[PDB]
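Worked example (supplementary).
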Amino acid sequence: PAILAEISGIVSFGKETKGKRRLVITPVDGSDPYEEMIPKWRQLNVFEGERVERGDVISDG
Amino acid sequence: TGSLSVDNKKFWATVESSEHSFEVPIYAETLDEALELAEWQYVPAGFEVTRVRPCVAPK
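After joint prediction of all chains, the assembly is encoded as:
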């Protein structure tokens, strides 16, 4: 991963205790949950409630 | 000792204190579940999370 969604679906954001960003992706590609805590300073894949594909968004890695 | 369910998947969370900075694995069943704990479990202890990296790698 780099600047991408590990899974295809609707990537959304949630609570951030300080200067973070809750990365909760809603998979459409399959029943494979993928959630992580990417900081807000990080160039994110895209905004919340946005449809993206596995690996394909901004930067693959 | 506080949270940490199981270690079916290894999740990494680097935490930063007033001066110290370290990395500690998160133990939970689900991704989001660990995501909750990484922040929610460490922040009341005075530890501020810096960044995390889940390491699933399908078995």
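Two points are worth noting when inspecting this output. Chain B touches chain A through 18 residues (CB under 8 Å). The first strand of chain B starts at residue 10 and ends at 16.
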